[PDB]
Every structure is written in structure tokens, then in C-alpha cells.
Design an enzyme around this catalytic site. Structure first.
Site, PDB file in Angstrom:
ATOM      1  N   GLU A 120       0.741  -1.238   0.000  1.00  0.00           N
ATOM      2  CA  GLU A 120       0.000   0.000   0.000  1.00  0.00           C
ATOM      3  C   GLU A 120       0.780   1.302   0.000  1.00  0.00           C
ATOM      4  O   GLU A 120       0.474   2.154   0.846  1.00  0.00           O
ATOM      5  CB  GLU A 120      -0.925  -0.027   1.251  1.00  0.00           C
ATOM      6  CG  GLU A 120      -2.259  -0.626   0.820  1.00  0.00           C
ATOM      7  CD  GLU A 120      -3.280  -0.751   1.924  1.00  0.00           C
ATOM      8  OE1 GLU A 120      -4.248  -1.528   1.725  1.00  0.00           O
ATOM      9  OE2 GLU A 120      -3.098  -0.087   2.964  1.00  0.00           O
ATOM     10  N   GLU A 165      -6.025  -7.111  -2.147  1.00  0.00           N
ATOM     11  CA  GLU A 165      -6.631  -6.879  -0.836  1.00  0.00           C
ATOM     12  C   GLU A 165      -7.939  -6.123  -1.013  1.00  0.00           C
ATOM     13  O   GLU A 165      -7.997  -5.103  -1.698  1.00  0.00           O
ATOM     14  CB  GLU A 165      -5.659  -6.124   0.068  1.00  0.00           C
ATOM     15  CG  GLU A 165      -6.027  -6.131   1.532  1.00  0.00           C
ATOM     16  CD  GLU A 165      -4.995  -5.438   2.404  1.00  0.00           C
ATOM     17  OE1 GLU A 165      -5.397  -4.746   3.365  1.00  0.00           O
ATOM     18  OE2 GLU A 165      -3.784  -5.598   2.138  1.00  0.00           O
TER      19      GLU A 165
END
Length: 358
Positions: A162, A282
Site C-alpha cells: 500500500e 486486498e
């Protein structure tokens, strides 16, 4: 299918016999926490957990870790050893990981390793911190690749979980340009084992547009990742709904008609334009709101159901197996045994098949 290392062809992933495969899996987290090990091994034997995951249909595990587990002598601190997990007693975090990787390979699952945190205290927006440096980052990635070199159970690495502000895609400033860092890391890795796949997430903002962390791949079209080894690059995004947090488009009156637009802009295009395979690494929700439930329903269709499209579709791994994620909840319930079959219900269309034993 799934034998040997894997590779790309356009927007599809192929095994060593050029049969297309679809990653359709789950996240099992904890090795990136300060417990230094997957969670739930306080209630379950790990082989029994793995078997349950296979049984439920998931074929791949995304395995988050932090660089703390590579500090020598690092040890797990949340495993129960009464009548279970006996072979994990006295092992380092890494020795435990070895164990999980092996059984999983033996039973037809695959593992993607995910540098999810620089250290167990939390995520970083950049791939480096004052405490953990790029060099350590890279040495660790190489250290892990060399550690599983020869076992195709581990098919590749998610370089950094991320990336976000102020990370940039292609801005050229080597202190914040994740596109260039990704290549640095990627080639380091392929320098050890050039048969691995390299999964690269997006940043969060680009040309004044902002999306979910690791989800913005809008700049990948003009400024692509180029690796020393061809047919190894998989781009990856993350996406969420409101249980995680508020975004303008859930309030858009034409929801969820808007969604595919947003998805296509941020990561979809790479698949549609046949540039590269795309992995939704995700995603999840507690499904507590109608909004989230439309979202998941819609998203699942967008990812292209396996029955209509087979492996010519989006790769995915859901968040998460673990019930102990506030924001999303999990597949398992709080007892670490009982399945949330309704949630599991939603993901049925995009599931695919277990792989061959490694």
C-alpha cells in the site's frame, strides 16, 4: 494445474506448461504483527487451518510479513502448543514460515509473500523509514527469495504493501517515486530467482486524482514498470467499501453504476487493454451495510466470474481469513472454526481450482 514457476502472457498468468491459472485466494495475516506469526494458532493446529482453507476453495495465500521477522532469533509469541502445533515449538518466526510454506505446497495451495510493514509497529507510505532503510528492505526481499529458491510453492513477491502519499508514480524524484523503487526491488529479487513473479501495487494519488492506498495505477500506462526479466510483472490494486471508510462515490446517486468507471480508471484499464495481469491483492468488508453488499456483489461481477471467463480474468485474494480485522471482519468467525458462509457465499463465482501438489 499450477506446476512449476509461473509466467505471464498478456493479461493472463500461466504455469510452466503454459496452462492459464487464476489466483483466487485469501489473506492470512500476523507475521507482520508484533506477534511475529499468523494469528489463530492459539486455537488451531496450523495444518488443520490450511486444510480448512483448501477445503473452502481458496487456492492461494497472501502472506503478510514485516522485516522484524528477519532479525535473527525473532520468535512467535502467540502460538498454543497443547495437543497441537507441536512441531513449531522452539522455532524462529522464519522457521515457522518454512513449515507453513511446505504443508501448503504439499496440499495444492500457493503462497505470495507480502512486505506489508517495515517493522511490526505499522505500515509506511514509502518503502523506507528512518529505522528501516531501502537497503534493508531489498536485502530482506533477496534473503526471502533465496530462502525459497527452488520451491515454487512461493510464486512471487508483493514488493511493498500500500504505497501512498507522498509516493509518486513516475515523477522522477528518487526519494518518492515508487515506480522507480519497484524496479530497483524487483530486479534485486529477479537477480536471485528470475522465475518469480513481481507484484507491484499502485500509489494513492496521481495527476490530482486520489484512490485507495496501493490502488492507484493510473500512471502505469505512461510510466510502466520494466524488469530485467520479461513476463514476470503483475500490477496490483486494493479497493474497499464503507466499513473501511468513506469515499465520494458511495454517495453518488448512480451507485453502483459509477463503480466500474472508477475501477477501470484506476487499475481495470491495464487488464482491458491487455497490458498485464491485474491482482486485487486486498479487499473486504464486514457486509454490515447495504452499500457494502452492493459493492461486493458488483465487484465480484466486475472481476469476471470463473464460469463465464475462466483464467482470463482478474486475480484476487480477499481480506481476510482472520476474524480479527475490525474494518472488514473475516471468513472465519471469532471462534477461529466457524465459517461466515454468507460472506464466503459472495466469493463463490470468482473462485477457481486448487493447484497441483508441489
Amino acid at each position: 494445474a499450477g506446476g512449476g514457476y509461473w509466467h505471464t502472457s498478456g493479461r493472463e498468468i500461466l504455469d510452466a506448461n503454459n496452462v492459464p491459472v487464476r489466483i483466487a485466494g485469501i489473506n492470512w495475516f500476523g507475521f507482520e504483527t508484533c506477534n511475529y506469526v499468523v494469528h489463530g494458532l492459539w486455537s488451531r493446529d496450523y495444518r488443520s487451518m490450511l486444510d480448512q482453507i483448501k477445503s473452502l476453495g481458496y487456492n492461494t495465500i497472501r502472506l503478510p510479513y514485516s522485516d522484524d521477522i528477519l532479525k535473527p532469533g525473532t520468535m512467535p509469541n502467540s502460538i498454543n502448543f497443547y495437543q497441537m502445533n507441536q512441531d513449531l515449538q522452539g522455532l524462529t518466526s522464519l522457521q515457522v514460515m518454512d513449515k507453513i510454506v511446505a504443508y501448503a505446497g504439499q496440499i495444492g495451495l500457493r503462497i505470495i509473500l507480502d512486505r506489508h510493514r517495515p517493522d511490526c509497529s505499522g505500515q509506511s507510505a514509502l518503502w523506507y523509514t528512518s529505522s528501516v532503510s531501502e537497503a534493508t528492505w531489498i536485502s530482506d526481499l533477496q534473503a526471502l527469495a533465496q530462502r525459497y529458491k527452488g520451491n515454487p510453492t512461493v510464486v512471487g513477491f508483493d514488493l511493498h504493501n500500500e504505497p501512498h502519499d507522498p509516493a509518486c508514480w513516475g515523477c522522477g524524484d528518487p526519494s518518492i517515486d515508487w515506480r522507480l523503487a519497484a524496479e530497483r526491488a524487483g530486479n534485486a529479487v529477479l537477480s536471485v530467482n528470475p522465475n518469480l513473479l513481481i507484484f507491484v501495487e499502485g500509489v494513492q494519488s496521481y495527476n490530482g486524482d486520489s484512490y485507495w492506498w496501493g490502488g492507484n495505477l493510473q500512471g502505469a500506462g505512461q510510466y510502466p514498470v520494466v524488469l530485467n526479466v520479461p513476463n514476470r510483472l503483475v500490477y496490483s490494486a486494493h479497493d474497499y467499501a464503507t466499513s473501511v471508510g468513506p469515499q465520494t462515490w458511495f454517495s453518488d446517486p448512480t451507485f453502483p453504476n459509477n463503480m466500474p468507471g472508477i475501477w477501470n480508471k484506476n487499475w481495470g484499464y491495464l487488464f482491458n487493454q491487455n497490458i498485464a495481469p491485474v491482482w486485487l491483492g486486498e479487499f473486504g468488508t464486514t457486509l454490515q451495510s447495504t452499500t457494502d453488499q452492493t459493492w461486493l456483489k458488483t465487484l465480484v461481477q466486475y472481476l469476471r466470474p470463473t464460469a463465464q471467463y475462466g483464467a482470463d480474468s482478474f486475480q484476487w485474494t480477499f481480506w481476510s481469513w482472520n476474524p480479527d480485522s475490525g474494518d472488514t471482519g473475516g471468513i472465519l468467525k471469532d471462534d477461529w472454526q466457524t465459517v461466515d458462509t454468507d460472506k464466503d457465499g459472495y466469493l463463490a463465482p470468482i473462485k477457481s481450482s486448487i493447484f497441483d501438489p508441489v
